[PDB]
Design an enzyme around this catalytic site. Structure first.
Site, PDB file in Angstrom:
ATOM      1  N   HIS A   9       0.831  -1.197   0.000  1.00  0.00           N
ATOM      2  CA  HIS A   9       0.000   0.000   0.000  1.00  0.00           C
ATOM      3  C   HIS A   9       0.874   1.258   0.000  1.00  0.00           C
ATOM      4  O   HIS A   9       0.776   2.097  -0.889  1.00  0.00           O
ATOM      5  CB  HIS A   9      -0.989   0.030   1.175  1.00  0.00           C
ATOM      6  CG  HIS A   9      -2.134   0.983   0.991  1.00  0.00           C
ATOM      7  ND1 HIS A   9      -1.961   2.312   0.638  1.00  0.00           N
ATOM      8  CD2 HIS A   9      -3.471   0.818   1.123  1.00  0.00           C
ATOM      9  CE1 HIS A   9      -3.134   2.913   0.544  1.00  0.00           C
ATOM     10  NE2 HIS A   9      -4.091   2.014   0.824  1.00  0.00           N
ATOM     11  N   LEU A  70      -3.219  -8.408   2.706  1.00  0.00           N
ATOM     12  CA  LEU A  70      -3.908  -9.562   3.233  1.00  0.00           C
ATOM     13  C   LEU A  70      -5.100  -9.872   2.337  1.00  0.00           C
ATOM     14  O   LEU A  70      -5.239 -11.005   1.912  1.00  0.00           O
ATOM     15  CB  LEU A  70      -4.346  -9.282   4.664  1.00  0.00           C
ATOM     16  CG  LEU A  70      -3.197  -9.079   5.628  1.00  0.00           C
ATOM     17  CD1 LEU A  70      -3.195  -7.640   6.124  1.00  0.00           C
ATOM     18  CD2 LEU A  70      -3.326 -10.053   6.781  1.00  0.00           C
ATOM     19  N   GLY A  73      -8.350  -5.918  -2.200  1.00  0.00           N
ATOM     20  CA  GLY A  73      -8.927  -4.600  -2.026  1.00  0.00           C
ATOM     21  C   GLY A  73      -9.246  -4.017  -3.387  1.00  0.00           C
ATOM     22  O   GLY A  73      -9.141  -4.721  -4.378  1.00  0.00           O
TER      23      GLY A  73
HETATM   24 CO   LIG Z   1      -5.761   2.552   0.250  1.00  0.00          CO
END
Ligand SMILES: [Co+2]
Ligand SMILES: [Co+2]
Lengths: 122, 122
Positions: A9, A70, A73
């Protein structure tokens, strides 16, 4: 001939990129990959495109990109495959190189082991 | 007497909460905890406060809260401790119960093993 690019990220705090860095180093120490680079999606350096180009510049033809996340997304299913030009739409274009986009971590028992340990202050 | 509460980001997509659910179930079947609940920070049910209260309602005195996050984020260092009232500032108040707030996953070798596997389409 094959590069491993770890991809995370990124955050305004440094913990995220520290993490990718330590992970890079541990896989470097397993002596399994010719080339190993990291790249953060947001607000950190290096970025994914930088990391990908940085791997081509060492003469990788097959780049293995592993999303160190994990869960699945939006980042793992829109933004990153975009950045890699795997989905039509700051773009990076590679030459007769194939990018191989792997799966995230997910509910692996080894996570549960980690989780259990983490509960007990271990 | 002790509860394990797994705690995750949460997202508009369901993958995140599916993950926590699978992880809950796997630790349930290790038969190590009297009570095991999950809670998502944003977007999803149940929430952390719900999960914490849901653990007190089964008669936990010591709640072990494990942040299922790779890195230390803002969420792990501001928002969640806030929700748990471990830091002065939709508040949750427990009665003479202690919340124990654990460390996130981090650069654990088991992650590298997972990562390596993930590279190889495994
Ligand atoms: Co984000
Ligand atoms: Co967030």
């Amino acid at each position: 001939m094959e590069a491993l690019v770890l991809v995370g990220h990124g955050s305004r705090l440094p913990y995220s990129k520290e993490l990718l860095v330590k992970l890079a180093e541990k896989v470097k120490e397993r002596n399994l990959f010719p080339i190993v680079e990291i790249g953060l999606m947001e607000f950190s350096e290096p970025t994914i495109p930088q990391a990908v180009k940085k791997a081509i510049e060492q003469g990788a033809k097959r780049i293995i990109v592993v999303p160190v996340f994990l869960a699945h997304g939006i980042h793992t299913t829109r933004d990153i495959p975009r950045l890699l030009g795997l989905i039509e739409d700051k773009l990076e274009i590679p030459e007769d190189v194939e990018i191989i986009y792997r799966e995230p971590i997910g509910a692996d028992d080894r996570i549960v082991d980690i989780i259990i340990d983490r509960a007990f202050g271990r």
